[PDB]
Structure 1
Amino acid sequence: EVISYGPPNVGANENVFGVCHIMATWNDTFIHVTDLSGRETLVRVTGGMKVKADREESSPYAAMQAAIDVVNRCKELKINALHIKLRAKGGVETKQPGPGAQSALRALARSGMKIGRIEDVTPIPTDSTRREGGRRGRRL
């Protein structure tokens, strides 16, 4: 039958908590579940996995497909609920999460996954090394 190599003893009352690190870039999206430690990785999905076009990598369609794959795969690991840690590229780069951010967050719960505590961890310089732009930034 079904041998789920996820946790031994559960109940219908019980909550099984995984953690979802979600990275949204203008160029892509990452939906990554692990345990509460962050050490042992459970599921991994990138937009680029879900589409063949380099430009679509970030898009909501891709984020959605990614999400549903993740959910389907947690479901058999017996995982009800993910905590969410959201991230943009951050550091010296932009701190605005990409387009896939919202879409993936939604599609996760849309898929009948409970949702735990939500935090934004975007890397935040106390202070920075110097930015990849020119002195004058991107012209055009």
Structure 2
Amino acid sequence: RKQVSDGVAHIHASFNNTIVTITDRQGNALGWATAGGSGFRGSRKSTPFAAQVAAERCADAVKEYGIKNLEVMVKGPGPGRESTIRALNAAGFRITNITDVTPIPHNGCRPPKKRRV
């Protein structure tokens, strides 16, 4: 319906899940898919493979604009940091730049207590 050809893959990779969002340079959301909503729950949801099909499913709800180049923004420590990026590149995508944007406070907010499991 419209045209971009130049995008950015923001991947949010937490421990429990990994959300993939495709966007233009402006930061406007073009398409998105998550692992948790691609048929993966709990123990399987938090896997690199689930992040992979997330990246794959996302490349199908965006090529309506015919993106052809993009940059990658890796946020968080979970799986699908890396495997998500791979799936994008195999789905027919030229990777321009890779950047980690995981936030690091300069020691500000006190985090939750340690879990005594």
- Does the alignment reach a TM-score above 0.5? yes
**What is the Cα deviation at residue 54 of structure 1?**
2.4
Sequence identity, in percent?
A: 37
CA contact (8 A) 1:20 1:83 kept: yes
The separation in 2 between residues aligned to 1:60 and 1:118, in whole angstroms, is 18
Structure 2: gaps of 5 or more residues: none
- Find the counterpart in structure 2 of residue 74 from structure 1: 62
Query: Is 1:36 the equivalent of 2:32?
Result: no
Q: How does 1:1-140 map to 2 (within 5 A)?
A: 5-7=1-3, 16-38=5-27, 40-88=28-76, 97-133=77-113, 137-140=114-117
- Identify, as 1 or 2, the structure richer in helix: 1
- For the aligned residues, what is the CA RMSD? 1.6
Larger Rg: 1
**What is the Cα deviation at residue 23 of structure 1?**
0.8
Q: Deviation digits for residues 2-46 of structure 1, max 9, x if unmatched?
A: xxx1228xxxxxxx21111101111000110111111x2111111
Q: Deviation digits for residues 44-96 of structure 1, max 9, x if unmatched?
A: 111111124223222122112111111223323110122111101xxxxxxxx
**What is the Cα deviation at residue 111 of structure 1?**
1.2
Question: Size of the alignment, in residue pairs?
Answer: 117
TM-score by length of 2: 0.89
TM-score by length of 1: 0.76
The separation in 2 between residues aligned to 1:52 and 1:115, in whole angstroms, is 27
Higher relative contact order (CA 8 A, sep 6+): 2
AA matched with 2:116: R
Structure 1: gaps of 5 or more residues: 9-15, 89-96
